[PDB]
């Protein structure tokens, strides 16, 4: 079925929505100022350590928030994460940072602080390097074509407004939605995004028993999508059209790792979204036989709105009221 013939009248509204959703430059400047100070602070105690932002705050797909997540990466065979973080908390307190707290996430130790200069809060963990590498991959994809961050911010805001962005309710994580957006753009013809992991690699690190290898010199790919003329409203329409009507839920796996559709049957997997490095991890495994129906009804609602509604941008994002 074809796209509506007035689709481009809604391009500018989607761009306006996108621009309202991304972090303000003034907030990003504050985050970069705090990061430089924290990097210098940690280096005074552990000159061989490195600090990396990860998560929503650095993969180029995070909504505005006064919180950052940082991985302290350090090599060694006897890394005692608790002892390191206790020492770090003491150093942070000596530095006049505020509300320094020792926390845990599912037995993983975390130190949180509030910077009184910038007002930004920061949570630090030790050696969560796979999350850093996942973040790097997404940030690298985001450099290739502006339509990725535009689509992903719109999809993430749709999922928040429609209340289908909570894994505890059997719906999808923001990370899952970004992978879906990357794969949708890999699948366009002409393509908008390449498959970085299928290219001759320039980057390769091993995290535990996971090797992470791909072409990361993405500045050379800034014209990769230039043959594709699809605009943001066409891509929003096409994305929900794909998940509502075209995706084969019984048989297919979406794989950013290959840029392609893999088979499910030979390997809870009701909406199969392959993690690009931890390929045994299906990001949709949180979905169950009930929440898959809610997800697909919302996909269908979105596709019908994009296809027929006279104000699709506003109607698409109308909040779900329980």
């Amino acid at each position: 079925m074809a796209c509506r013939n007035d689709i481009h009248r809604y391009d500018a509204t989607f761009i306006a929505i996108y621009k309202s959703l991304i972090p303000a430059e003034e907030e990003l400047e504050k985050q970069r100022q705090l990061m430089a100070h924290l990097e210098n602070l940690v280096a005074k105690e552990w000159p061989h350590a490195k600090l990396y932002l990860y998560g929503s705050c650095a993969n180029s797909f995070g909504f505005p928030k006064s919180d950052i997540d940082v991985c302290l990466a350090i090599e060694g065979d006897d890394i005692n994460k608790s002892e390191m973080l206790l020492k770090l908390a003491e150093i942070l307190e000596s530095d006049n940072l505020q509300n320094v707290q020792a926390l845990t996430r599912a037995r993983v130790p975390i130190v949180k602080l509030m910077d009184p200069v910038t007002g930004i809060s920061c949570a630090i963990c030790i050696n969560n390097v796979l999350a850093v590498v996942n973040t790097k991959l997404l940030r690298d994809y985001a450099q290739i074509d502006v339509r990725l961050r535009q689509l992903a911010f719109i999809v993430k805001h749709w999922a928040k407004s429609r209340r289908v962005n909570e894994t505890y309710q059997g719906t999808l994580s923001s990370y899952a939605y970004v992978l879906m957006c990357i794969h949708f753009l890999q699948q366009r013809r002409p393509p908008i995004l390449p498959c970085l992991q299928e290219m001759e690699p320039t980057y390769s690190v091993r995290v535990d028993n996971i090797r992470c290898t791909y072409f990361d010199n993405v500045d050379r790919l800034r014209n990769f999508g230039s043959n594709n003329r699809e605009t943001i409203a066409e891509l929003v329409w096409g994305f929900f059209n794909y998940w509502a009507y075209a995706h084969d839920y019984a048989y297919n796996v979406v794989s950013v790792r290959t840029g392609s559709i893999l088979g499910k049957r030979e390997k809870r997997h009701l909406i199969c979204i392959e993690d690009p490095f931890e390929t045994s991890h299906d990001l949709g495994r949180v979905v169950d036989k009930f929440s898959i129906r809610v997800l697909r009804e919302e996909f269908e609602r979105a596709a019908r709105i994009m296809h027929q509604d006279p104000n699709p941008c506003a109607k698409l994002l109308e909040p779900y009221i329980p």
Side-chain angles (χ1 to χ4, degrees), residues 43-59:
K44 293 188 277 189
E45 184 75 19
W46 298 285
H48 50 301
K50 310 106 153 180
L51 293 192
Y52 302 100
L53 289 143
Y54 71 95
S56 268
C57 62
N59 54 25

Side-chain angles (χ1 to χ4, degrees), residues 12-29:
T13 303
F14 277 120
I15 296 299
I17 294 173
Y18 163 71
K19 285 176 188 176
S20 70
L21 290 169
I22 57 181
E25 270 304 314
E26 314 211 304
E27 291 303 314
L28 297 176
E29 288 287 286

Side-chain angles (χ1 to χ4, degrees), residues 107 191 293 307 310:
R107 309 205 175 189
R293 308 184 74 78
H307 191 64

Side-chain angles (χ1 to χ4, degrees), residues 33-64 66-97:
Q33 168 194 333
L34 176 58
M35 277 304 300
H37 178 76
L38 291 177
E39 282 195 76
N40 287 343
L41 176 151
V42 159
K44 293 188 277 189
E45 184 75 19
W46 298 285
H48 50 301
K50 310 106 153 180
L51 293 192
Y52 302 100
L53 289 143
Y54 71 95
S56 268
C57 62
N59 54 25
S60 192
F61 306 98
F63 285 12
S66 44
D67 205 318
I68 58 173
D69 275 284
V70 166
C71 165
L72 191 161
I74 186 171
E75 324 188 335
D77 287 349
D78 303 0
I79 300 294
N80 191 321
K81 296 182 182 181
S82 283
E83 294 317 292
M84 272 193 77
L85 285 174
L86 295 173
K87 177 60 155 169
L88 175 63
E90 174 209 284
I91 297 165
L92 299 167
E93 282 175 334
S94 293
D95 187 63
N96 297 320
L97 297 164

Side-chain angles (χ1 to χ4, degrees), residues 21-64 66-254:
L21 290 169
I22 57 181
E25 270 304 314
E26 314 211 304
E27 291 303 314
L28 297 176
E29 288 287 286
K30 287 153 103 171
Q31 296 180 3
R32 293 188 279 251
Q33 168 194 333
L34 176 58
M35 277 304 300
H37 178 76
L38 291 177
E39 282 195 76
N40 287 343
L41 176 151
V42 159
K44 293 188 277 189
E45 184 75 19
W46 298 285
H48 50 301
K50 310 106 153 180
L51 293 192
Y52 302 100
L53 289 143
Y54 71 95
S56 268
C57 62
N59 54 25
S60 192
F61 306 98
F63 285 12
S66 44
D67 205 318
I68 58 173
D69 275 284
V70 166
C71 165
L72 191 161
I74 186 171
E75 324 188 335
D77 287 349
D78 303 0
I79 300 294
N80 191 321
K81 296 182 182 181
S82 283
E83 294 317 292
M84 272 193 77
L85 285 174
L86 295 173
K87 177 60 155 169
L88 175 63
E90 174 209 284
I91 297 165
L92 299 167
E93 282 175 334
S94 293
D95 187 63
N96 297 320
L97 297 164
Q98 294 188 350
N99 303 326
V100 180
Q101 329 165 61
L103 302 169
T104 63
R105 303 178 190 165
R107 309 205 175 189
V108 173
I110 302 290
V111 170
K112 195 159 143 58
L113 64 105
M114 162 71 61
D115 172 25
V117 171
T118 196
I120 292 165
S121 56
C122 177
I124 303 162
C125 63
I126 309 288
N127 279 340
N128 181 12
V129 293
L130 187 61
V132 170
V133 179
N134 290 341
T135 299
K136 177 177 154 52
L137 181 65
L138 270 49
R139 172 173 71 253
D140 284 341
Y141 270 115
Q143 303 305 300
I144 294 169
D145 196 290
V146 70
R147 285 169 293 186
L148 171 55
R149 55 180 71 105
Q150 288 166 355
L151 176 66
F153 271 83
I154 290 163
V155 168
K156 279 179 56 166
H157 184 245
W158 165 85
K160 283 321 278 186
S161 319
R162 298 307 298 174
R163 313 287 299 284
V164 289
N165 184 226
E166 295 245 5
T167 56
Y168 282 96
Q169 309 180 268
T171 61
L172 298 164
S173 72
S174 291
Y175 178 49
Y177 282 115
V178 175
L179 292 178
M180 295 157 80
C181 291
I182 293 173
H183 189 258
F184 176 72
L185 297 180
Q186 285 171 329
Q187 286 282 114
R188 309 316 292 160
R189 293 298 186 262
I192 290 171
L193 293 177
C195 178
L196 298 176
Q197 286 163 268
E198 283 283 314
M199 299 175 62
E200 166 86 319
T202 58
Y203 171 85
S204 191
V205 300
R206 165 138 77 148
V207 173
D208 282 271
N209 278 329
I210 294 150
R211 196 101 212 176
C212 307
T213 302
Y214 65 99
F215 182 85
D216 82 335
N217 194 7
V218 293
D219 294 344
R220 294 219 300 149
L221 299 173
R222 298 162 75 246
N223 295 323
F224 181 85
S226 64
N227 291 350
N228 178 293
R229 287 285 187 92
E230 296 183 83
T231 66
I232 186 57
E234 284 185 289
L235 294 170
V236 171
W237 175 85
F239 177 89
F240 289 113
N241 209 76
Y242 172 78
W243 285 101
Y245 304 128
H247 181 73
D248 191 327
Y249 288 86
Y251 290 112
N252 285 2
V253 175
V254 296

